[PDB]
Write a protein of this length. Structure first.
Ligand SMILES: *[C@@H]1O[C@H](CO)[C@@H](O[C@@H]2O[C@H](CO)[C@@H](O)[C@H](O)[C@H]2NC(C)=O)[C@H](O)[C@H]1NC(C)=O
Ligand SMILES: *[C@@H]1O[C@H](CO)[C@@H](O)[C@H](O)[C@H]1NC(C)=O
Ligand SMILES: *[C@@H]1O[C@H](CO)[C@@H](O)[C@H](O)[C@H]1NC(C)=O
Ligand SMILES: *[C@@H]1O[C@H](CO)[C@@H](O)[C@H](O)[C@H]1NC(C)=O
Lengths: 49, 11, 49, 196, 49, 49
């Protein structure tokens, strides 16, 4: 699984090179991960899957 | 797991 | 000069048909999203004896 | 290798049990004598084939002379099916050409046995499951129930499981990759510095 | 503000003016770039603004 | 004898692109019973814009 920006950026956009919008998908999926991995006692099972 | 379908869906 | 010959089982000759497509590449087209990079192609059909 | 008179077929690697297809069997002659051929194929109960051009007798084929026939066939069984084709010569049929000796070796009939593949009919589709188990100095268990037989066909159902740990699949290349010399502005300096 | 082209392509846009010294105005039918494949150095297309 | 000649042509052979420049059309009528030909140069500046 993963997540993106909102499936395409709504306003007129793009023309290549990620202009003012680096597409930030790997970073945010990884932040999601790091959230999923976080727990005081120890994380659970499901967050691990 | 894998398998085949569509013996129906006929109109 | 151009030629073609179809080797076969035991390299024997095979009767049949052929179409060569000799081709230049990379025409004036922009080759991007509405444009074929395919440049001038000449197609030569033959009945291989 | 070679053969003075042989038979070769043509068909794809794999097919589908439901729909049919044709099987194209050519015969080839390289001996100077020009002979009528009796070509056919023995079939199993595991499918159903029918000819297109069986009623007419072939006439002859000479040196470098190749005839061809076909068979419209639908598979029944699943997996690999051997297809058998027998071709031989005939004497005393001097109607196509001048003569017809038709006296080959003890294996005068080319009796070739060829397999093919067939996949199970219907739109093939899948299902995925995953699980992370970690007995931390102990024991853990799980149970996974696999049941989706709505409007399905027998024996297309397959599954499989795979055990691993997948941190190391890409831990080689990227890890040895990016270890670089710092330079540039503070921005670029961080860019090159932080990742390491 | 949006508008549309009529049978004569005409639009009579009105703008109230209680504002700063000098004003700039533009109109388009598409966006501020030659959207299909503008960056190649080997492209041939544009749209007026 | 009556009316005038027509022809609808296809521009695929022209490659209406970056590095193929403006369009000159030279039309040459050979009037019969004189062999007499005369030309008109036309639409040289068809703005392939
Ligand atoms: C028919 O196909 C089957 C395989 O689907 C063949 O059965 C055996 O195949 C193994 C190799 O997997 C060979 O080592 C055996 O020799 C095969 N059995 C026989 C009959 O010898 C089989 O050879 C094919 N031919 C027929 C008509 O049975
Ligand atoms: C090309 O073919 C012709 C005859 O078809 C031959 O004369 C010639 O030498 C061949 N090779 C060339 C021109 O390089
Ligand atoms: C432009 O504004 C009008 C409302 O005045 C609206 O109907 C229209 O949807 C807007 N443009 C687009 C592309 O929606
Ligand atoms: C023009 O727009 C301004 C916006 O504040 C408003 O004050 C003014 O009344 C408008 N004049 C008109 C609609 O005539």
């Amino acid at each position: 699984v993963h997540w993106e920006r909102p499936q395409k950026p709504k306003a007129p956009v793009g023309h290549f090179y990620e202009p003012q919008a680096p597409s930030a998908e790997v970073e945010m999926t990884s932040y999601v991960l790091l959230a999923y991995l976080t727990a005081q006692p120890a994380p659970t099972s499901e967050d691990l899957t | 797991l894998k398998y085949n379908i569509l013996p129906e869906k006929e109109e | 000069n151009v030629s073609v010959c179809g080797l076969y089982t035991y390299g024997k000759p095979v009767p049949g048909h052929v179409t060569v497509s000799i081709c230049r590449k990379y025409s004036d087209a922009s080759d991007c999203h509405g444009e074929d990079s395919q440049a001038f192609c000449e197609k030569f059909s033959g009945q291989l004896n | 290798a070679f053969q003075p008179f042989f038979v070769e077929l043509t068909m794809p690697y794999s097919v589908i049990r439901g729909e049919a297809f044709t099987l194209k069997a050519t015969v080839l002659n390289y001996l100077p004598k020009c002979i009528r051929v009796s070509v056919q194929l023995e079939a199993s109960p595991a499918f159903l084939a029918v000819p297109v051009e069986k009623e007419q007798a072939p006439h002859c084929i000479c040196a470098n002379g190749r005839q061809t026939v076909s068979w419209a066939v639908t598979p029944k069984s699943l997996g690999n099916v051997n297809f058998t084709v027998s071709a031989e010569a005939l004497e005393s049929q001097e109607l196509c050409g001048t003569e017809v000796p038709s006296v080959p070796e003890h294996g005068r009939k080319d009796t070739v046995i060829k397999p093919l593949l067939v996949e199970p009919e219907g739109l093939e589709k899948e299902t995925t499951f995953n699980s992370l188990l970690c007995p931390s100095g102990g024991e853990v268990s799980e149970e996974l129930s696999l049941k989706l037989p709505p409007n399905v066909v027998e024996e297309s159902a397959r599954a499989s499981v795979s055990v691993l740990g997948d941190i190391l699949g890409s831990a080689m290349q990227n890890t040895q990759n990016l270890l670089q010399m710092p330079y540039g502005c503070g921005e670029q300096n961080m860019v090159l510095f932080a990742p390491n | 503000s949006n508008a549309t082209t009529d049978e004569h392509g005409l639009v009579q846009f009105s703008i109230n003016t209680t504002n700063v010294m000098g004003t700039s105005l533009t109109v388009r039918v598409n966006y501020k770039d030659r959207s299909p494949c503008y960056g190649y150095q080997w492209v041939s297309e544009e749209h007026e603004e | 004898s009556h009316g005038c000649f027509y022809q609808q042509v296809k521009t695929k052979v022209f490659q209406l692109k970056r590095k193929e420049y403006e369009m000159k059309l030279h039309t040459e009528a050979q009037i019969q019973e004189e062999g007499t030909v005369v030309e008109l140069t036309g639409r040289q500046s068809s703005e392939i814009t």
